[PDB]
Write an enzyme that holds these catalytic residues in place. Structure first.
Site, PDB file in Angstrom:
ATOM      1  N   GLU A 212      46.199 -46.125 -37.507  1.00 48.61           N
ATOM      2  CA  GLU A 212      44.757 -45.241 -37.036  1.00 48.61           C
ATOM      3  C   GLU A 212      45.167 -43.975 -36.517  1.00 48.61           C
ATOM      4  O   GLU A 212      45.529 -44.108 -35.252  1.00 48.61           O
ATOM      5  CB  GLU A 212      43.952 -46.057 -36.415  1.00 48.61           C
ATOM      6  CG  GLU A 212      42.660 -45.541 -36.266  1.00 48.61           C
ATOM      7  CD  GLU A 212      41.568 -46.397 -35.429  1.00 48.61           C
ATOM      8  OE1 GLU A 212      42.031 -47.770 -35.448  1.00 48.61           O
ATOM      9  OE2 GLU A 212      40.751 -46.003 -34.563  1.00 48.61           O
ATOM     10  N   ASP A 214      43.299 -41.239 -34.538  1.00 54.09           N
ATOM     11  CA  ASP A 214      42.125 -40.706 -33.634  1.00 54.09           C
ATOM     12  C   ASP A 214      41.698 -39.390 -33.336  1.00 54.09           C
ATOM     13  O   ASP A 214      41.960 -39.003 -32.272  1.00 54.09           O
ATOM     14  CB  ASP A 214      41.631 -41.603 -32.682  1.00 54.09           C
ATOM     15  CG  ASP A 214      42.079 -43.041 -32.871  1.00 54.09           C
ATOM     16  OD1 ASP A 214      42.523 -43.379 -33.897  1.00 54.09           O
ATOM     17  OD2 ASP A 214      41.921 -44.031 -32.086  1.00 54.09           O
ATOM     18  N   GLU A 217      37.540 -38.562 -30.885  1.00 54.04           N
ATOM     19  CA  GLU A 217      36.848 -39.661 -30.654  1.00 54.04           C
ATOM     20  C   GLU A 217      35.748 -39.184 -29.522  1.00 54.04           C
ATOM     21  O   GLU A 217      36.248 -38.769 -28.594  1.00 54.04           O
ATOM     22  CB  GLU A 217      37.426 -40.899 -30.141  1.00 54.04           C
ATOM     23  CG  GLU A 217      38.130 -41.662 -31.244  1.00 54.04           C
ATOM     24  CD  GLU A 217      38.713 -43.008 -31.030  1.00 54.04           C
ATOM     25  OE1 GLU A 217      38.446 -43.906 -31.728  1.00 54.04           O
ATOM     26  OE2 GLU A 217      39.527 -43.304 -29.954  1.00 54.04           O
ATOM     27  N   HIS A 228      47.461 -44.336 -33.105  1.00 54.57           N
ATOM     28  CA  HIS A 228      47.739 -45.740 -32.725  1.00 54.57           C
ATOM     29  C   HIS A 228      48.649 -46.208 -33.827  1.00 54.57           C
ATOM     30  O   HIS A 228      48.111 -45.972 -35.243  1.00 54.57           O
ATOM     31  CB  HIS A 228      46.797 -46.662 -32.703  1.00 54.57           C
ATOM     32  CG  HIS A 228      45.214 -46.533 -32.244  1.00 54.57           C
ATOM     33  ND1 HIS A 228      44.222 -46.872 -32.858  1.00 54.57           N
ATOM     34  CD2 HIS A 228      44.735 -45.693 -31.130  1.00 54.57           C
ATOM     35  CE1 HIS A 228      43.131 -46.348 -32.288  1.00 54.57           C
ATOM     36  NE2 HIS A 228      43.344 -45.654 -31.289  1.00 54.57           N
TER      37      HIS A 228
HETATM   38  O1  LIG Z   1      37.540 -44.617 -33.656  1.00 55.64           O
HETATM   39  C1  LIG Z   1      38.030 -45.432 -34.635  1.00 55.64           C
HETATM   40  C2  LIG Z   1      38.171 -46.933 -33.775  1.00 55.64           C
HETATM   41  O2  LIG Z   1      37.831 -46.591 -32.462  1.00 55.64           O
HETATM   42  C3  LIG Z   1      38.328 -47.985 -31.615  1.00 55.64           C
HETATM   43  O3  LIG Z   1      37.974 -47.626 -30.251  1.00 55.64           O
HETATM   44  C4  LIG Z   1      39.126 -48.062 -29.392  1.00 55.64           C
HETATM   45  C5  LIG Z   1      39.953 -46.683 -28.897  1.00 55.64           C
HETATM   46  O4  LIG Z   1      40.626 -46.126 -29.850  1.00 55.64           O
HETATM   47  C6  LIG Z   1      40.898 -46.886 -27.804  1.00 55.64           C
HETATM   48  O5  LIG Z   1      41.149 -45.602 -27.298  1.00 55.64           O
HETATM   49  C7  LIG Z   1      40.371 -47.744 -26.613  1.00 55.64           C
HETATM   50  O6  LIG Z   1      41.380 -48.044 -25.546  1.00 55.64           O
HETATM   51  C8  LIG Z   1      40.701 -48.694 -24.571  1.00 55.64           C
HETATM   52  C9  LIG Z   1      40.807 -50.322 -24.471  1.00 55.64           C
HETATM   53  O7  LIG Z   1      39.582 -50.692 -25.366  1.00 55.64           O
HETATM   54  C10 LIG Z   1      40.550 -51.082 -23.401  1.00 55.64           C
HETATM   55  O8  LIG Z   1      41.335 -52.142 -23.302  1.00 55.64           O
HETATM   56  C11 LIG Z   1      41.114 -50.177 -22.037  1.00 55.64           C
HETATM   57  O9  LIG Z   1      40.659 -50.769 -20.918  1.00 55.64           O
HETATM   58  O10 LIG Z   1      40.688 -48.895 -22.325  1.00 55.64           O
HETATM   59  C12 LIG Z   1      41.420 -48.330 -23.235  1.00 55.64           C
HETATM   60  C13 LIG Z   1      41.593 -46.821 -23.124  1.00 55.64           C
HETATM   61  O11 LIG Z   1      42.012 -46.404 -21.677  1.00 55.64           O
HETATM   62  O12 LIG Z   1      39.794 -48.988 -27.261  1.00 55.64           O
HETATM   63  C14 LIG Z   1      38.470 -48.595 -28.088  1.00 55.64           C
HETATM   64  C15 LIG Z   1      38.103 -50.005 -28.493  1.00 55.64           C
HETATM   65  O13 LIG Z   1      37.602 -50.377 -27.234  1.00 55.64           O
HETATM   66  C16 LIG Z   1      37.426 -48.922 -31.938  1.00 55.64           C
HETATM   67  O14 LIG Z   1      37.850 -50.022 -31.403  1.00 55.64           O
HETATM   68  C17 LIG Z   1      37.771 -49.337 -33.583  1.00 55.64           C
HETATM   69  O15 LIG Z   1      36.888 -50.528 -33.848  1.00 55.64           O
HETATM   70  C18 LIG Z   1      37.310 -47.892 -34.229  1.00 55.64           C
HETATM   71  O16 LIG Z   1      37.450 -48.050 -35.705  1.00 55.64           O
END
Ligand SMILES: OC[C@H]1O[C@@H](O[C@H]2[C@H](O)[C@@H](O)[C@H](O[C@H]3[C@H](O)[C@@H](O)[C@H](O)O[C@@H]3CO)O[C@@H]2CO)[C@H](O)[C@@H](O)[C@@H]1O
Ligand SMILES: OC[C@H]1O[C@@H](O[C@H]2[C@H](O)[C@@H](O)[C@H](O[C@H]3[C@H](O)[C@@H](O)[C@H](O)O[C@@H]3CO)O[C@@H]2CO)[C@H](O)[C@@H](O)[C@@H]1O
Length: 430
Positions: A212, A214, A217, A228
């Protein structure tokens, strides 16, 4: 899952352009397709194989759900889903109202012919696009990214699906798309549990995994550039224990990076760089050109002609620069207080071996039931705050609430257009 013929499938055309060198490219008469989770599933004597968030008695198992049901053309993409293309612009509507329903966000994949979405060779070239998110508010993600799905739709890989890219089957990113109703042409009905706030959703047993990247976003208050990588980047299936992401109790469970390595200017210590009124004014529309080199991903803007460079980070012990290089991904974590999946699943080499895998361009707008876009537009996880990494936007941590931001500004729209693809520095000249 075969296709149902109560509705024909009509992909709005979306022109993009293949470049070779600056001030000179080549258009691309393309089309667009909506992800397969938004269509209708039924059997021969018509009636849902899946109604609302729950499956139907008509269905019984992963296998006999694919040989019994089928998916359908999308009706009018404009009235039913806020879908609307105009030459080069693909508008997408957040909140759309119709006679008997209520579509909520959608996903769209650039195509090559009605059979194949269009594969993309990133590594060494760049991608650019004009974007008008000026009315994309706190809690909504107007998204543009690459996710290595299959070329034809996975139709040869899993021929239980004879719908193929023709009907938006096959979606996979780096969180294992557990929500899909079908993955590798099998239905995720067995043990399908329904959502607890989303009347259209549920999480399945299998997820659809792969790499993936991104590129974009966001919404008008903050943006994030997040690649990722996986231990295998290509399309691939995880099975319940071996599924991570938002949709499984173990986020880092499986072969992929669900957090990846972002660069959100705000998160990196620059508050006043991006928004309404900021350097990069999100009240208006702009250009985001982004590049792919081994150990380096660059991303610059063009607003009112001017080149706008993103600010390098602020906090002590972080790289001097804004670029997504393995010095970043290393250091980011010596002070950002977060679990380093990035090094786990391969580090930036594995991502580079991901930068060479055939990909397809998704454009999208959505709200997120599990965290209300908290991770993107503000301080998250909202468990203390005031630490490095938690603040990621200028949105109060009250927003993003599905129902709520669906009611507050339901005219919200993202507007995608003037796509440019080619070798590094062909799409513009900055
Ligand atoms: O756009 C496509 C996909 O987006 C996904 O969102 C994830 C982000 O890519 C990622 O940056 C973010 O990271 C978070 C994490 O979730 C969290 O554990 C942590 O506390 O903060 C991180 C960043 O500091 O995760 C999100 C998902 O929560 C979608 O998940 C995905 O389905 C979608 O296709
Ligand atoms: O006719 C079937 C119905 O489809 C509705 O589309 C919903 C889908 O059922 C659902 O799979 C999709 O899931 C999205 C979710 O909205 C979003 O929050 C998340 O980020 O991504 C998910 C990917 O599955 O939600 C859509 C939104 O409605 C039609 O909208 C509806 O008219 C129709 O009855």
């Amino acid at each position: 899952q075969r296709a149902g013929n109560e509705t024909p499938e009509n992909h709005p055309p979306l022109t993009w352009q293949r470049c070779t060198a600056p001030g000179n490219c080549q258009t691309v008469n393309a089309e667009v397709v909506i992800d397969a989770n938004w269509r209708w599933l039924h059997d021969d004597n018509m009636q849902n194989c899946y109604d609302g968030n729950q499956w139907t008695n008509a269905c019984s198992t992963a296998t006999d759900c694919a040989e019994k049901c089928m998916i359908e053309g999308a009706g009018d993409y404009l009235g039913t889903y806020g879908a609307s293309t105009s030459g080069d612009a693909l508008t997408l509507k957040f909140v759309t109202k119709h006679e008997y329903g209520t579509n909520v966000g959608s996903r769209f994949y650039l195509m090559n012919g009605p059979d194949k979405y269009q594969m993309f060779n990133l590594m060494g070239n760049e991608l650019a696009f004009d974007v008008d998110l000026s009315t994309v508010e706190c809690g909504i993600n107007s998204a543009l990214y690459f996710v290595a799905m299959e070329e034809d739709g996975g139709m040869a890989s899993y021929p239980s699906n004879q719908a193929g890219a023709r009907y938006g089957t096959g979606y996979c990113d780096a969180q294992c798309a557990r929500d899909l109703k079908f993955v590798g042409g099998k239905a995720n009905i067995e043990g399908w549990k329904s959502s607890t706030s989303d009347p259209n959703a549920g999480v399945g047993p299998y997820g659809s995994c792969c790499a993936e990247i991104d590129v974009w976003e966001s919404n008008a208050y903050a943006f994030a550039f997040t690649p990722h990588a996986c231990t295998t980047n290509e399309y691939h299936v995880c099975e319940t224990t071996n599924c991570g992401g938002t949709y499984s109790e173990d986020r880092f469970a499986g072969k992929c990076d669900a957090n990846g390595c972002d660069y959100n200017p705000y998160r990196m210590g620059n508050p006043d760089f991006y928004g309404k009124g900021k350097t990069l004014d999100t009240s208006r529309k702009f250009t985001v050109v982004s590049r792919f080199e081994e150990n380096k991903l660059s991303q610059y803007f063009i607003q009112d002609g001017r080149k706008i460079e993103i600010p390098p980070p602020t906090w002590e012990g972080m790289p001097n620069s804004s670029e997504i290089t393995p010095e970043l991904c290393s250091t980011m974590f010596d002070v950002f207080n977060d679990r380093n999946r990035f090094e786990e699943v391969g580090g930036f080499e594995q991502l580079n071996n991901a930068l060479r895998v055939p990909m397809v361009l998704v454009m999208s707008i959505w709200d997120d039931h599990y965290a209300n876009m908290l991770w993107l537009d503000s301080i998250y996880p909202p468990e203390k705050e005031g630490q490095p990494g938690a603040a990621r936007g200028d949105c109060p941590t009250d927003s993003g609430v599905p129902a709520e931001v669906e009611a507050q500004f339901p005219d919200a729209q993202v507007v995608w257009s003037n796509i440019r693809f080619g070798p590094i520095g062909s799409t513009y000249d900055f």
